[PDB]
Design a protein around this ligand. Structure first.
Ligand SMILES: Nc1nc2c(ncn2[C@@H]2O[C@H](COP(=O)(O)OP(=O)(O)OP(=O)(O)O)[C@@H](O)[C@H]2O)c(=O)[nH]1
Ligand SMILES: CN[C@@H]1CCc2c(ccc(O)c2O)[C@H]1O
Lengths: 281, 52, 332, 231
């Protein structure tokens, strides 16, 4: 029953991301500074849909981790790495649009291909420092009976953490990008409204929905997909025996689903649509 | 500019023209004769191609 | 009254004189030959380095080096074999519309919206001569020799220059619209030009007066090129038609058009034998025709903007195309 | 032969270093085309603030203006070259409504420019020149606009209008009628990809170099907003 859905999710995540990557790679008219961030985001989503989802589905359905403890730790590390590096690229895209709209004269000098590469490697390094380093060095393990038994067992792979790691990772992965995106998009909306009023005041008699709809889609999908999990992540650590494991896994998978929506949001340009027609059909 | 146009028209009005059949035959003969050494028309092997 | 009546009578005599010559259409004799078939070409090289659109291009006589011009104000000389830039000349004026490459390979010409033609010395790079006297923008220029050059401009006039003294040896008049292109004969004894009044004329370089006039088009003519024989030429206008004219018969022979294309034509060129006719269009691609049958034999696609330049090597080994995407491509 | 390939590569690498140094300059400068109907005080406008090129800088931004005077022809086939400029500056004498008229010829030229196939994404900055003597001849009863433009009879000043301090109300009607004549053509076929920015300019004006700055800033901002599906 659940296998068909859990496989359809995998195919949906893989297909769109690989299509976007190959469309950007094959055609030379899409090679833009903005598209490098989209390429990085697509790579992160593809790695997520290729590695994290199938093994989580197998663990849920089989109700047993048939691999070793080393593979459980590796799977957790790659999970955190893929989740952190995907959210933080949306912040970079928002900041790029902010600089493009608010400061049009200096935008060309502000960003260059070398600067884009430096930023991308910086974000990937920061994402990798918070996932592999604190997990492989065993700085995140809990110190109660259930956690100790889970760590000792060879077939049980679960998630138990301290409070320090939970708040630190949650803040770094989600909360810092959120306020930046909110501020940036509010300023962009204000500028768009100002320009619309300026247009109306000059030639109105001769002859906000669009911006509102665009910003609403962009912010709503991300917030609705990733907020409940990053609230319960703090809550279950602060007070014990309030959040059931089933709710935790359900919210985590709802967050995972977001990887299949990004090509539908950031790749609707007419140019992208043309390439997709030549590539397919 | 009235006299200039008439003088030019009279100059090029008195010329000897041949029937179009001869011109078509000449063009066809030239093409048939020189079709052998036409690298675009007749592809060349990769040994003799400097752009491959 | 008398002048207008006299001109009408003379023109009618010419029109009926060539009406008796046409006893059979060109397609009638060439109706009994096998077609060339399907021709497929693939890009071999792509040349990058120009910061803006490309308006001009000219192959070298050695079939190895070519020059190109761009709106950013550079004049780059390439190396098609190894794909290496050899020279890069910064132009005083950014608006450039044409370029030429000397037959001996020792000079390069240039010109545009400043009404000035410049000659550069490549084996010494700096300006060697500036030719002035045109009252309109230059459209084309071709090297007769190492010491003389013929140019066409937008003041409805062509001129033959002397590089040593910088003076117009002779001037050609008779067009009523802007002259857009020209092409020299294999023996460099005559040349043809195409203007915006939908007419093409045949000139005598040494004597200096027109010989014949052809008026088969209905819009501005953008390109022109002799048949390799030297007794025919083809033109292309922005009404989506190419037409073939014959010098000795003083009339057109065949037209090349299709009902699925409505864009303009920017450049035409023949092949080594003359069996194929290559034409560039505003539809971002290029078309390959059969000269003796008027049917398409292939398509060249791969440019993201309109094709503005076209050329074929003297040995007929490759085709170069330039476009507003700031890229050059070699086809084979 | 081995050293020949090395010799070519050394020269190619040096050239590509210079090309990168010149791409920064090319992308950091803005190109403007100056166009006028004729006898419209174009020289006075360009002076106060083949082909003639002028360069000026305001607030550390480089602007580079082009004026064509060596191609004085009724037909303009060279206009497809300027399809990547930031803006087109159009200068018209608003007072030439009775002299032979010139205002209708300028309107026809503007209509021809706006609907061109290659200038389909280029905005126009409009300078309505010679306001002082226009006001003088309008206040004087020697001639009336109604005898040259019959549509002026049934025109009234819009409620959302900004008149000059102390301006006679018979000059405001003329000014706004002449401006709306151009605005009608501007908005008739505009698909939302390019607008028009009209201004009232005199001989003694000094802020003509700030208006161009502001209009270019608006042009680029609107272009980016429309690209990101926000406008
Ligand atoms: N009162 C007044 N006089 C002006 C104004 N602009 C120009 N003039 C005068 O009108 C005279 C002729 O106009 P020009 O500025 O020379 O026009 P132009 O140089 O021919 O410009 P183009 O025709 O576009 O080439 C100038 O000598 C100025 O003194 C103006 O705005 N107000
Ligand atoms: C087991 N799934 C993990 C659990 C905790 C966690 C995730 C993602 C990003 C973080 O910063 C986290 O702290 C989830 O993907």
């Amino acid at each position: 029953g659940m296998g068909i859905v859990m496989s359809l999710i995998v195919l949906a995540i893989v297909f769109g991301n690989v299509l976007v990557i190959t469309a950007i790679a094959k055609f030379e008219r899409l090679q833009t500074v903005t598209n490098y961030f989209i390429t990085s985001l697509a790579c992160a989503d593809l790695v997520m849909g290729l590695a994290v989802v199938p093994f989580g589905a197998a663990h849920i359905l089989t109700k047993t981790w048939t691999f070793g403890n080393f593979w459980c730790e590796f799977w957790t590390s790659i999970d955190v790495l893929c989740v952190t590096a995907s959210i933080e690229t949306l912040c970079v895209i928002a900041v790029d649009r902010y600089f493009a709209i608010t400061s049009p004269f200096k935008y060309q000098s502000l960003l260059t291909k070398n600067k884009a590469r430096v930023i991308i490697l910086m974000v990937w390094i920061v994402s990798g420092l918070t996932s592999f380093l604190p997990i492989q060095m065993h700085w995140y393990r809990a110190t109660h009976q259930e956690a100790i038994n889970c760590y000792a067992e060879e077939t049980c792979c679960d998630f138990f953490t301290n409070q320090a790691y939970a708040i630190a990772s949650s803040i770094v992965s989600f909360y810092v990008p959120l306020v930046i995106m909110v501020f940036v998009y509010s300023r962009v909306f204000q500028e768009a409204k100002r320009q619309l009023q300026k247009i109306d005041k000059s030639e109105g008699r001769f002859h906000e929905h669009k911006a509102l709809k665009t910003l609403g889609i962009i912010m709503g999908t991300f917030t609705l997909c990733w907020l409940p999990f990053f609230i319960v992540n703090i809550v279950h650590v602060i007070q014990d025996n309030l959040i059931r494991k089933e709710v935790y896994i359900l919210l985590n998978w709802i967050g995972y689903v977001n990887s299949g929506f990004n090509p539908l949001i950031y790749c609707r340009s007419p140019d992208f649509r043309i390439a997709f027609q030549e590539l397919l059909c | 500019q009235a006299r200039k146009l008439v003088e030019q028209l009279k100059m090029e009005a008195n010329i000897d023209r041949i029937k179009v059949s001869k011109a078509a035959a000449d063009l066809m003969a030239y093409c048939e004769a020189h079709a052998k050494e036409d690298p675009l028309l007749t592809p060349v092997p990769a040994s003799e191609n400097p752009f491959r | 009254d008398q002048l207008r009546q006299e001109a009408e009578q003379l023109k009618n005599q010419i029109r009926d004189a060539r009406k008796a010559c046409a006893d059979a259409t060109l397609s009638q004799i060439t109706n009994n030959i096998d077609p060339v078939g399907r021709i497929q070409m693939r890009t071999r090289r792509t040349l990058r380095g120009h910061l803006a659109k490309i308006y001009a291009m000219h192959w070298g006589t050695d079939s190895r080096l070519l020059v190109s011009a761009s709106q950013d104000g550079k004049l780059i000389i390439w190396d098609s074999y190894t794909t290496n830039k050899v020279h890069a000349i910064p132009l005083r004026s950014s608006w450039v519309m044409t370029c030429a490459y000397a037959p001996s390979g020792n000079y390069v010409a240039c010109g545009g919206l400043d009404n000035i033609c410049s000659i550069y010395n490549l084996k010494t790079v700096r300006v060697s001569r500036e030719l002035a006297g045109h009252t309109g923008y230059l459209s084309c220029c071709r090297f007769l020799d190492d010491n003389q050059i013929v140019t066409s401009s937008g003041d409805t006039t062509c001129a033959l220059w002397d590089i040593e003294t910088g003076q117009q040896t002779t001037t050609f008049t008779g067009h009523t619209g802007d002259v857009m292109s020209l092409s020299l004969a294999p023996d460099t004894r005559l040349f043809v030009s195409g203007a915006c009044d939908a007419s093409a004329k045949l000139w005598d370089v040494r004597e200096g007066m027109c010989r014949q006039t052809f008026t088969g088009h209905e819009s501005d003519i953008n390109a022109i090129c002799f048949f390799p024989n030297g007794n025919a030429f083809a033109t292309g206008s922005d009404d989506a038609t190419c037409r073939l004219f014959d010098l000795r018969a003083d009339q057109e022979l065949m037209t090349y058009s299709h009902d699925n294309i409505i864009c303009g034509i920017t450049s035409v060129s023949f092949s080594k034998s003359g069996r194929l006719l290559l034409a560039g269009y505003d539809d971002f691609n290029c078309n390959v025709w059969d000269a003796l049958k008027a049917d398409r034999a292939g398509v060249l696609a791969g440019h993201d903007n309109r094709v503005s330049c076209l050329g074929v090597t003297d040995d007929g080994m490759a085709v170069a195309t330039g476009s507003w995407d700031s890229f050059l491509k070699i086809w084979n | 032969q081995r050293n020949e390939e090395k010799a070519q590569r050394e020269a190619n690498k040096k050239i590509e270093k210079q090309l990168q140094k010149d791409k920064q300059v090319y992308r950091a400068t803005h190109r403007l085309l100056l166009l006028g109907a004729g006898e419209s005080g174009k020289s006075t406008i360009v002076k106060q603030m083949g082909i003639f090129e002028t360069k000026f800088q305001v607030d550390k931004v480089n602007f580079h203006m082009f004026d064509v005077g060596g191609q004085r022809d009724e037909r303009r086939k060279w206009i497809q070259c300027f399809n990547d400029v930031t803006a087109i500056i159009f200068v018209v004498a608003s007072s030439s409504y009775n002299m032979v008229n010139r205002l209708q010829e300028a309107l026809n030229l503007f209509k021809s420019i706006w609907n061109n196939r290659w200038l389909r994404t280029i905005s126009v900055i409009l300078f309505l020149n010679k306001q002082d003597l226009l006001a003088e001849k309008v206040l004087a009863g020697k001639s009336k606009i109604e005898d040259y433009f019959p549509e002026f009879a049934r025109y009234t000043t819009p409620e959302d209008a900004t008149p000059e301090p102390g301006e006679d109300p018979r000059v405001t009607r003329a000014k706004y009628f002449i401006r709306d004549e151009f605005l009608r053509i501007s908005t008739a076929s505009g698909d939302g990809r390019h607008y028009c920015y009209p201004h009232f300019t005199c001989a003694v004006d000094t802020e003509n170099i700030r208006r161009v700055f502001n209009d270019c800033r608006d042009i680029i901002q609107r272009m980016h907003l429309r690209q990101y599906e926000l406008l």
